[PDB]
């Protein structure tokens, strides 16, 4: 399974291009795909959402209208069309999949990323900690406070923790909370309270250094949080 | 007092007679019930007649009777 | 000769039959007559699951008591969602004829039987978002009637050749073959401790097997016609059988004899599925006269009939923690009573 | 509508799943299912090979043959080594039941016992199905196969050996007519179900035409009850 | 001055005995309609299991006659006491009477299309009745709503001189001429198109029932003849006298006072036969079906 | 031959004659005492209000 995409380059402001996501290894028809960007010196930002069969489509506030998303189920590709783009979009885009049913793990696998360069009411989530030092062998605790009660009335509380190792794409660690992802050791352990949440790691190794992002999924648009790097 | 309704008179009589030969006069207009205006003149013996208002001497009689009575 | 050897077996039945009479000091009615009656128990259809387009043949609650699997004859096996009616999965079967289904205790697998005597085991929580067969367990000779999981690596299958087998999942071969029946097995149930299990055959006999050595321990002969359903007591110390004679006969495992029978003059129609409720007090039984009666497990008195189905009531099921009682009739609707 | 983002997206999956059942439920209704009865060597393998367009399924062998824009099904129940009544509830709702009788079994004795001729063995087999409690609306498309051997065998072997009370000659025109007289009168209901007899040949291609002309009758009769006309 | 009587107008006779029956006939037809049609609606909703394609049409067709039942007492009170209800009430109830006058009849032709697909197209080839049933029923009601608009828009209960108020059609000075175009709708879509669809659709089911040999097909061979004959027995006499009135209005047939009163009595008396189809409707569609009766007995037992 | 099929029955049936059986009264006493202990933890005995009932509607 992989999500490889192509595109990018040097773009004059006000132009129009296309971003193509080629999917191979799963059932693309049953997966509601996303689009997430990342500025060279900032965190993550959500772009667009398309459901299975292009039933319902949502857009971010900053790309509403000038961005168009579409999927090609027989062609097994995901398409993004950007028009009248400005110089504030000099960021590389991720291709993120997600399947929504009972017990599923959304945002399971992330694409690689295409670098695009240009020459010139929602839930707010913040993390106070940033670049906190850590040593191999000492437990570390990360807190990501929200602004709205993330505990829904049906007993499910939504908060996703992502780990972005340096160089490559982020991977899912903890979906809604207290649930481990598919393919992650048991060392990670997350707990929540409704507005204040905590991720605790018992033991850590050299590969656990990176940037941790907390994302909610209660209502679109869904907002990430400021990165919290780990220092040796 | 019904479901269907049409014009009262179909055939007109167009010969001159005595102008003061009729005592009571019935005036009928042309609203949503009929496509033409009709008049009714009746004698005490029990015979009623309908004229054609478009005819020459018919018109000059109907207003004269109303003015007299 | 054969007759002399058979005569030894003929007289061997006498002492055990006499031992049961010698141990029947007091019946259940006269020891529990001074008990408070349960009274009328009226239940209302909380949900109706109307996705199928054919006859529902089986169902099985999950361990989490929310997910629910059900298989009909239209070649579909839909994994429901009891709380909010949503089809989590729609699994297209290889064969249209299926007579049973099961749901794994962990929730990773669902196993469906069939009239083509192959137990196909599906995988749900996998990469790529598909639902593909993890294994097909061939080896039976008749048809397959009911299969349950011990864990994610073991399964016990009933069959139509009077044999119950115990498979492994990583491999494809069998482990033990529970033979000894004369009539073929129609339904079985695993004990709560998952160490013993009884199977209701088609010769008015239910046997208590064990999964360690692979041979029967106790045999019970109290019914007259074929036993068409069976289920353990919630404590693993007794089990009840519903047969074609419209009698829900409850046995036990430490005295090895019939405790009581629940029969009424008005009911003549057979029995399709018997499943105890939690605490072993409400012996819900699904008759094939379009109704689903509710028998008290200690007193012969009846209770509220769970009627409302337009056809036979094929299979019941009581959730593990005991709120709902889902019944699948041959009309295409499930009804999750409560 | 007091629904979360994931819960709302889950319902979008339910109806997309639901639509694939509806778009496939229209294909199952057009499908025609046909059980087949008869012995293992009484012409069971003869009529199934006339037209078939499509070994781990030892239980039920299936044939997906089609004709004139209609996809027929064929569940030859021969591998069920158990009582017929046990799984006969599983086949309720089948459109028809093709039944075969070997015409040359009058002089053929049963293998295990020197009595209970194959027709007489099928005599109780027909009653157990045609008069069955569940099988009351399923018309029995009955075939007379192996007709190319019966006409030349009764010249020296009279049919009276099978039926103790025959009272007839040995002419194939009337012998075949006489035999089917009992078969069509074996049903306890003379109007709920009907028997579409047919004296098929060993090479005729009209067999599939005949079963088409009898299945369409069932669908018309099945639809007449629903519409209320009949 | 001579004397003659060929020009003397006559007065529209309103016999007391005539209006004795009219008010009585409306009440009994409404009573029968409120029971037979509501019972059909009562049975279908409770079952909710095995609801086939034809159960939807019977639900709507029983609903169509049920609404038409409520309009019957309204017309009865104005037959003797005039339309003293008011201008507003004249427009609303006339719309209600005409929508189910057509959807009641269009569904009879709509059902006949459904019975043509289920029988003649026995092999599931052009059977489009799978899920279109909800859409086709909406079209049948939808077509009726736009058909009754001319009745609802301009119909004022004004005051004829020397007569009680009537819920008559009010327009410009061309009331007779304008109504001639309006008279086409009860004929071109009330009788002609429903009859052409009905006879063509039932023209081929009789062919298949004749050329096929089912189990007791004679009963189905007869029920079709019963419904067709009743439709010709009920609506055709109303349309014949209605069509005749057009000829005298356009001066084709000679006009006389003797037939002037006869046509008025004939139009109202034959209109009763039109309302008769709203009570026989459950009897010849619902209670005659084998599936419906067994469902009816289940409800009674409960 | 066929005697072998009937041969294995008698030795197998001997074990059913060796299993100890307690009195049915003792079994019934435990069978009824188990139910009353768990009678408070079965919601099919005493119906529960809409609050803790998950199948609310």
Numbering used by the authors:
A (entry chain E): 2 to 121, 124 to 235
B (entry chain F): 1 to 69
C (entry chain C): 3 to 340
D (entry chain B): 3 to 56, 179 to 354
E (entry chain A): 21 to 322
F (entry chain D): 7 to 63
Task: Paste lines from the article.
The chemokine CXCL8 (also known as interleukin-8, abbreviated IL-8) and its G-protein-coupled receptors CXCR1 and CXCR2 are crucial elements in this process, and also the development of many cancers. CXCR1/2 are expressed by various immune and non-immune cells including neutrophils, macrophages, and endothelial cells. Both receptors bind the pro-inflammatory CXCL8, although CXCR2 interacts with a wider range of agonists. The monomer folds into a three-stranded β-sheet with an α-helix at the C-terminus.
CXCR1 was purified as a complex with the wild-type CXCL81–72 and Gαi1 protein, together with Gβ1 and Gγ2, stabilised by a single chain variable antibody fragment scFv16. Refinement of the model led to a map with a final nominal resolution of 3.4 Å. The N-terminal region of CXCR1 fits loosely into a groove in the CXCL8 monomer to create the interaction surface CRS1. At CRS2, the CXCL8 N terminus interacts with the surface pocket formed between the TM helices of CXCR1. These interactions found in CXCR1 and CXCR2 trigger the inward movement of the N-terminal end of TM5, and movement of TM6 towards the cytoplasm. At the same time, N182ECL2, at the tip of the hair-pin in CXCR1, is displaced roughly 4 Å towards the chemokine when compared to the position of the equivalent N191ECL2 in CXCR2.
